[PDB]
Design a protein around this motif. Structure first.
Motif, PDB file in Angstrom:
ATOM      1  N   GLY A  45       3.568 -39.482 -17.782  1.00 28.39           N
ATOM      2  CA  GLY A  45       2.506 -39.974 -16.664  1.00 28.39           C
ATOM      3  C   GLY A  45       1.518 -40.315 -17.367  1.00 28.39           C
ATOM      4  N   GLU A  46       0.470 -41.225 -16.576  1.00 26.01           N
ATOM      5  CA  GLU A  46      -0.632 -41.743 -17.234  1.00 26.01           C
ATOM      6  C   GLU A  46      -1.810 -40.726 -16.936  1.00 26.01           C
ATOM      7  OE1 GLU A  46      -0.856 -46.004 -15.795  1.00 26.01           O
ATOM      8  OE2 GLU A  46       0.761 -44.924 -14.426  1.00 26.01           O
ATOM      9  N   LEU A  47      -2.739 -40.595 -17.895  1.00 24.49           N
ATOM     10  CA  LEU A  47      -3.775 -39.602 -17.755  1.00 24.49           C
ATOM     11  C   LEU A  47      -4.888 -39.860 -16.808  1.00 24.49           C
ATOM     12  CD1 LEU A  47      -5.537 -37.438 -19.537  1.00 24.49           C
ATOM     13  CD2 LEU A  47      -6.920 -39.532 -19.975  1.00 24.49           C
ATOM     14  N   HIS A  48      -4.783 -39.343 -15.747  1.00 20.99           N
ATOM     15  CA  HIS A  48      -5.531 -39.483 -14.583  1.00 20.99           C
ATOM     16  C   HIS A  48      -6.412 -38.506 -14.105  1.00 20.99           C
ATOM     17  CE1 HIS A  48      -2.635 -36.589 -12.628  1.00 20.99           C
ATOM     18  NE2 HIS A  48      -1.625 -37.373 -12.888  1.00 20.99           N
ATOM     19  N   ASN A  49      -7.673 -38.689 -14.070  1.00 26.04           N
ATOM     20  CA  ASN A  49      -8.745 -37.761 -13.804  1.00 26.04           C
ATOM     21  C   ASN A  49      -8.655 -36.865 -14.929  1.00 26.04           C
ATOM     22  OD1 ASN A  49     -10.050 -38.423 -11.188  1.00 26.04           O
ATOM     23  ND2 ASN A  49      -8.050 -38.224 -10.229  1.00 26.04           N
ATOM     24  N   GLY A  50      -8.347 -37.062 -16.078  1.00 26.46           N
ATOM     25  CA  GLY A  50      -7.993 -36.339 -17.082  1.00 26.46           C
ATOM     26  C   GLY A  50      -6.942 -35.313 -17.084  1.00 26.46           C
ATOM     27  N   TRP A  51      -5.969 -35.719 -16.500  1.00 31.37           N
ATOM     28  CA  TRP A  51      -4.708 -35.051 -16.553  1.00 31.37           C
ATOM     29  C   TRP A  51      -3.390 -36.229 -16.616  1.00 31.37           C
ATOM     30  CZ3 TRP A  51      -3.441 -29.868 -15.978  1.00 31.37           C
ATOM     31  CH2 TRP A  51      -4.507 -28.979 -15.975  1.00 31.37           C
ATOM     32  N   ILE A  52      -2.706 -35.819 -17.886  1.00 32.80           N
ATOM     33  CA  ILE A  52      -1.552 -36.504 -17.983  1.00 32.80           C
ATOM     34  C   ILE A  52      -0.315 -35.642 -18.037  1.00 32.80           C
ATOM     35  CG2 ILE A  52      -2.377 -36.578 -20.346  1.00 32.80           C
ATOM     36  CD1 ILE A  52       0.319 -36.398 -20.987  1.00 32.80           C
ATOM     37  N   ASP A  53       0.861 -36.120 -17.573  1.00 38.70           N
ATOM     38  CA  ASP A  53       2.132 -35.671 -17.708  1.00 38.70           C
ATOM     39  C   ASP A  53       3.050 -35.813 -18.841  1.00 38.70           C
ATOM     40  OD1 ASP A  53       1.113 -35.869 -14.854  1.00 38.70           O
ATOM     41  OD2 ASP A  53       2.540 -34.425 -14.283  1.00 38.70           O
ATOM     42  N   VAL A  54       3.903 -35.243 -19.237  1.00 38.22           N
ATOM     43  CA  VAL A  54       4.795 -35.337 -20.715  1.00 38.22           C
ATOM     44  C   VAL A  54       6.219 -34.622 -20.116  1.00 38.22           C
ATOM     45  CG1 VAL A  54       3.660 -33.538 -21.776  1.00 38.22           C
ATOM     46  CG2 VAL A  54       4.986 -35.485 -22.672  1.00 38.22           C
ATOM     47  N   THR A  55       7.082 -35.333 -20.540  1.00 36.29           N
ATOM     48  CA  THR A  55       8.538 -34.745 -20.235  1.00 36.29           C
ATOM     49  C   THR A  55       9.243 -34.263 -21.565  1.00 36.29           C
ATOM     50  OG1 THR A  55       9.042 -35.843 -18.390  1.00 36.29           O
ATOM     51  CG2 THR A  55      10.880 -34.962 -19.633  1.00 36.29           C
ATOM     52  N   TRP A  56       8.864 -33.056 -22.154  1.00 32.63           N
ATOM     53  CA  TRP A  56       9.263 -32.795 -23.727  1.00 32.63           C
ATOM     54  C   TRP A  56      10.607 -32.699 -23.636  1.00 32.63           C
ATOM     55  CZ3 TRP A  56       5.340 -31.738 -26.790  1.00 32.63           C
ATOM     56  CH2 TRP A  56       4.125 -31.535 -26.227  1.00 32.63           C
ATOM     57  N   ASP A  57      11.276 -32.702 -24.960  1.00 30.00           N
ATOM     58  CA  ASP A  57      12.801 -32.823 -25.098  1.00 30.00           C
ATOM     59  C   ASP A  57      13.540 -31.815 -24.495  1.00 30.00           C
ATOM     60  OD1 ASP A  57      15.195 -32.379 -26.714  1.00 30.00           O
ATOM     61  OD2 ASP A  57      15.036 -34.346 -27.133  1.00 30.00           O
ATOM     62  N   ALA A  58      12.907 -30.643 -24.892  1.00 32.68           N
ATOM     63  CA  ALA A  58      13.629 -29.231 -24.657  1.00 32.68           C
ATOM     64  C   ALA A  58      14.044 -29.178 -23.240  1.00 32.68           C
ATOM     65  CB  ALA A  58      12.483 -27.905 -24.595  1.00 32.68           C
ATOM     66  N   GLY A  59      13.402 -29.901 -22.460  1.00 33.53           N
ATOM     67  CA  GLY A  59      13.749 -29.934 -21.006  1.00 33.53           C
ATOM     68  C   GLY A  59      12.719 -29.525 -19.964  1.00 33.53           C
ATOM     69  N   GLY A  60      11.763 -30.111 -19.905  1.00 36.03           N
ATOM     70  CA  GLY A  60      10.766 -29.727 -19.020  1.00 36.03           C
ATOM     71  C   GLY A  60       9.316 -30.573 -19.057  1.00 36.03           C
ATOM     72  N   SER A  61       8.877 -31.024 -17.773  1.00 37.36           N
ATOM     73  CA  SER A  61       7.773 -31.756 -17.865  1.00 37.36           C
ATOM     74  C   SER A  61       6.570 -31.217 -17.195  1.00 37.36           C
ATOM     75  CB  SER A  61       7.827 -33.160 -17.227  1.00 37.36           C
ATOM     76  OG  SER A  61       7.058 -34.070 -17.339  1.00 37.36           O
ATOM     77  N   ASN A  62       5.245 -31.174 -17.365  1.00 39.67           N
ATOM     78  CA  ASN A  62       4.095 -30.898 -16.718  1.00 39.67           C
ATOM     79  C   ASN A  62       2.874 -31.466 -17.161  1.00 39.67           C
ATOM     80  OD1 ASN A  62       2.056 -28.602 -15.924  1.00 39.67           O
ATOM     81  ND2 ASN A  62       3.595 -27.922 -14.883  1.00 39.67           N
ATOM     82  N   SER A  63       1.883 -31.288 -16.265  1.00 41.53           N
ATOM     83  CA  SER A  63       0.544 -31.650 -16.358  1.00 41.53           C
ATOM     84  C   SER A  63      -0.451 -30.926 -17.461  1.00 41.53           C
ATOM     85  CB  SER A  63      -0.290 -32.245 -15.153  1.00 41.53           C
ATOM     86  OG  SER A  63      -0.921 -30.849 -14.720  1.00 41.53           O
ATOM     87  N   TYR A  64      -0.994 -31.685 -18.480  1.00 40.42           N
ATOM     88  CA  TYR A  64      -1.736 -30.810 -19.392  1.00 40.42           C
ATOM     89  C   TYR A  64      -3.192 -31.411 -19.441  1.00 40.42           C
ATOM     90  CZ  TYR A  64       2.260 -28.598 -21.448  1.00 40.42           C
ATOM     91  OH  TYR A  64       3.294 -27.747 -21.281  1.00 40.42           O
ATOM     92  N   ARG A  65      -3.977 -30.528 -19.358  1.00 36.59           N
ATOM     93  CA  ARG A  65      -5.820 -30.856 -19.673  1.00 36.59           C
ATOM     94  C   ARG A  65      -5.805 -31.755 -20.825  1.00 36.59           C
ATOM     95  NH1 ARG A  65      -9.413 -25.822 -18.892  1.00 36.59           N
ATOM     96  NH2 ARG A  65      -7.715 -24.311 -18.819  1.00 36.59           N
ATOM     97  N   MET A  66      -6.382 -32.885 -20.448  1.00 44.76           N
ATOM     98  CA  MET A  66      -6.742 -33.884 -21.725  1.00 44.76           C
ATOM     99  C   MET A  66      -8.110 -34.545 -21.290  1.00 44.76           C
ATOM    100  SD  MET A  66      -4.894 -34.302 -24.305  1.00 44.76           S
ATOM    101  CE  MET A  66      -5.065 -36.109 -24.576  1.00 44.76           C
TER     102      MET A  66
END
Length: 86
Positions: A45-66
């Motif tokens: 996902g694209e960093l929106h309002n200082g929040w970007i999503d990422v789908t790790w390999d392990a198996g799980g995606s979530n938004s992280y404070r950037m």
């Protein structure tokens, strides 16, 4: 054009795009979400309002404070270089 000494914050955010490579940052207060041992992830996902999503390999995606609160939880992968422009 004109240029000089480089050095400014909110730089990584320029690469924070859906499809790039990223890894745990210094502000990583969360557990090993991308399984262990530590591994590399892939922004989705694209960093929106200082929040970007990422789908790790392990198996799980979530938004992280950037930047939302001035804390970079995610960072560029160890060896990843911005996308060539031309």
């Amino acid at each position: 054009g004109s240029s000089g000494s480089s050095g400014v914050r909110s730089q990584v955010l320029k690469y924070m795009v859906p499809g790039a490579r990223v890894i745990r940052g210094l502000d990583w207060k969360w557990r090993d979400q991308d399984g262990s041992p530590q591994g590399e992830g892939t922004v989705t996902g694209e960093l929106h309002n200082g929040w970007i999503d990422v789908t790790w390999d392990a198996g799980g995606s979530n938004s992280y404070r950037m930047g939302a609160e001035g804390k970079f939880d995610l960072k560029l992968a160890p060896g990843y270089s911005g996308p060539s422009s031309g």
